Amino acid sequence: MTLLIRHATEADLPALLAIYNDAVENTLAIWNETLVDLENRHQWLENRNRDGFPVLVAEREGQVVGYASYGPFRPFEGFRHSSELSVYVASNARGGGIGRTLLAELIEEARERKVHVLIAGIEAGNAASIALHRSQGFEECGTLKQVGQKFGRWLDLLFMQKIL
Amino acid sequence: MTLLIRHATEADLPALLAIYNDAVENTLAIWNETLVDLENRHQWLENRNRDGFPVLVAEREGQVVGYASYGPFRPFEGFRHSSELSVYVASNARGGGIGRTLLAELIEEARERKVHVLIAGIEAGNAASIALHRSQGFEECGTLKQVGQKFGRWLDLLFMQKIL
Ligand code: NA
């Protein structure tokens, strides 16, 4: 059915939590193994809202089925016009345009807020994510080999970028 | 004369400050434009020490002529075995082998401390710095274009890595 894209509120935190923890448990999309709690997600959203970094949710039949945001790429003031983005789709809702719609809307937000470069950091083995980012105009930069670890395995990070 | 490489002490802080502010003012090696004070560097050093991250200095004819350190590449637990390194040489002592000697010793400290990957982020035009890192076994990962800004210019970031 119809996808509503809007900004996240406190009311959405249970959904955001469930989606985030699912990715922590089951995937190589988040390189942490630590499940978080509601307090953690409140602080995450609060700090996003505080710094003026958007959090968008996708809502279907009254249910949040995905979310996206961007945040700082690197601390230094020299990187202030660069932001690193993340998109999460609920595992039950893959394939239907949620991730692509979220990414497209986030890109428009970034433009309005004068972000210069969006950066995606993608686990290098994830061909689907790589092509989908490519399809909205991201370009490969390069891979940092074995810079991550999860489940005792070394992970490679592919960076892509889109210049606005 | 020959260099002495050793760990930084609180006594070295005026020298560290001078080298750091020189880099801020006069180079594209640090993509901050804001000068700092002695207290800033005191907190920086204290936090390095506290967190288990080495700070090395090079001493020649009694004077500190450069320093090097490494710290977290990215905040998240997934990246705990990756560190990003920096090497600064006095503006009036460039081209004298200091940076290469510092890098070499920092690499050994990293090895000892069980770092898995060292990352260098280098302004892409700095062919000297790239060749220096390459001489120590770093390989190019790729370039993120226009991700920094300094002196009103967009700047390109080349990542290199060394797996220990
Ligand atoms: Na909006």
CA terminus-to-terminus distance, chain B = 31
Contact A81 B143 (CB under 8 A): no
Residue A76 and residue A78: Cα distance in Å, rounded? 5
Ligand 1 geometric centre to CA of A4 (Å): 12
For residues A78 and B147, give the distance between their C-alpha atoms in angstroms, rounded to a whole number: 8
Q: Which residues of chain B have a CB within 8 Å of the CB of A34?
A: 77
Residue A72 DSSP SS3: strand
The candidate with the shortest Cα–Cα distance to B113, out of B69, B65, B60, B64, is B69
> Which secondary-structure segment (H or E) carries A101?
helix A98-112
Contact call for residues A67 and A8 (beta carbons, < 8 A) = yes
Rounded alpha-carbon distances, angstroms, from residue A154 to A23, B78, B81, B103, B150: 18, 9, 10, 24, 34
Nearest CA in chain B to A159: B144
Closest-CA residue to A37 (of A22, A53, A17)? A17
First to last CA, chain A: 31
Q: Number of structural domains, chain B?
A: 1
Size of interface A-B (CB pairs under 8 A): 95
User: Residue type for A1, please?
Assistant: M
Q: At what angle do helices B127-135 and B98-112 cross, to 10 degrees?
A: 50
Task: Quickly count: other Cβ atoms within 10 Å of residue B71's Cβ.
Answer: 15
Strand partners, A53: none
HSE of B161, CA atoms in CB hemisphere, 13 A: 21
Q: Quick one: closest CA in B to A152, which residue?
A: B78
What kind and span of H or E run contains B99?
helix B98-112
The Cα A7–Cα A79 span in angstroms is 25
> Which CATH number goes with the domain that contains B161?
3.40.630.30
The helices-and-strands tally (H runs, E runs) of chain A is: 4, 7
Range of the domain at A122: 1-164
Q: Are B127 and B29 in contact (CB under 8 A)?
A: no
Cα A82 from Cα A85, distance rounded (Å)? 10
Look at residue B11 and give its three-state secondary structure.
helix
User: How determined?
Assistant: X-ray
- Contacts of residue A80 in chain B, CB cutoff 8 Å? 149
Tokens 């968008």 locate to A56
- Find the largest Cα–Cα distance for chain A: 43
**B116: nearest Cα among B70, B64, B67, B50:** B70
CA-to-CA dists, residue B164 to B63, B88, B112, B115, B118, angstroms: 31, 22, 10, 7, 8
Report resolution (Å) to 1 decimal.
1.8
